[PDB]
Structure 1
Amino acid sequence: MSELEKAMVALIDVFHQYSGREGDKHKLKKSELKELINNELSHFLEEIKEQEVVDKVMETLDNDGDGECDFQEFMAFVAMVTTACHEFFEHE
C-alpha cells in the first residue's frame, strides 16, 4: 500500500479498535471516544480529564443525535482535527 492508502486503513482500524469495546460494536460511546482521544491523539489534542469535555466533544461530532459517534461522524472528526493541525502550521 501507498502512504495514503495505509493512512486510510489506519483510520478504519483505530475506529474499530475503540468502537468494538462496548455496546454497538460500530459506534463510539463517550467512554470509547475519550479513550481514543487520550491514547491516540496525545500529540494533537489536550488530554481529556473532565466529564464536561468528553460531553462537549460528543455533542459536537454527533450529527444524528443518538449520543454516539458512528463511522461517518468519526470521519468528520478526523477531518476537523487534521484541518486544525494543517492550519495551525501555516503560514511560515
Structure 2
Amino acid sequence: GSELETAMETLINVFHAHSGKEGDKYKLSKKELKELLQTELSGFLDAQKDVDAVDKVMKELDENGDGEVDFQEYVVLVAALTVAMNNFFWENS
C-alpha cells in the first residue's frame, strides 16, 4: 500500500486504538472521539480554535453524535478540520 494507504492504515490504527478503549472490534464513539480528535489534531486544533469551521465540524460530528462514529465518519472529522485549517494554509501561505 502507498503512503496514503499507510496513512489511512495509520488512521485505522488510531481509530482502532480508540475502538479498543471504548470496547469495540471496530468503532469509535463520541467519547474517545472528542479526546482523540483533539489529541491527534493537536496542531490543527490549536491553530483554528477560534475558527468557525471547527465548531461546524464539531457540531457536524455532534449531529453525528447519535452514538457511534465509524472510520469514514472519523476520517472526515479529522479531514474537515485538517482541510479547514489547511485551506487557510493554501490561501494564507
Is 1:73 matched up with 2:73?
A: yes
Q: Deviations over 1:21-55 (max 9, x none)?
A: 12434222232112212321111114xxxxxxxxx
Residues 1-92 of structure 1: matches in 2 within 5 Å? 1-46=1-46, 57=58, 59-61=59-61, 66-91=66-91, 92=93
C-alpha displacement of 1:17: 0.3
More helix by share: 2
State the 1:60 CA deviation. Answer: 1.8
SS at match of 2:77: helix
Q: Is the 8 A contact 1:61 1:76 kept in 2?
A: no
Residues in 1 aligned to 2:77 and 2:38: alpha-carbon distance in whole angstroms: 15
So what's the TM-score if we normalise by structure 1?
Answer: 0.66
1:62·1:73 contact (CA, 8 Å) conserved in 2? no
Structure with larger RCO (C-alpha < 8 A, sep 6+): 2
2:50 corresponding residue in structure 1: none
TM superposition score normalised by structure 2: 0.66
Identity of aligned residues (%): 56
**For 1:63 and 1:24, how far apart are their aligned partners in 2?**
21
- How many residues are matched? 84
Q: Would the aligned equivalents of 2:30 and 2:65 in 1 still touch at CA under 8 Å?
A: no
Structure 2: state its 5+ residue gaps: 47-56
How many angstroms does 1:62 deviate by? 5.8
- Cα RMSD of the aligned pairs, angstroms, is 2.9
Q: 1:62 to 1:72 in 2, by over 3 A?
A: farther
Shift of 1:65: 5.8
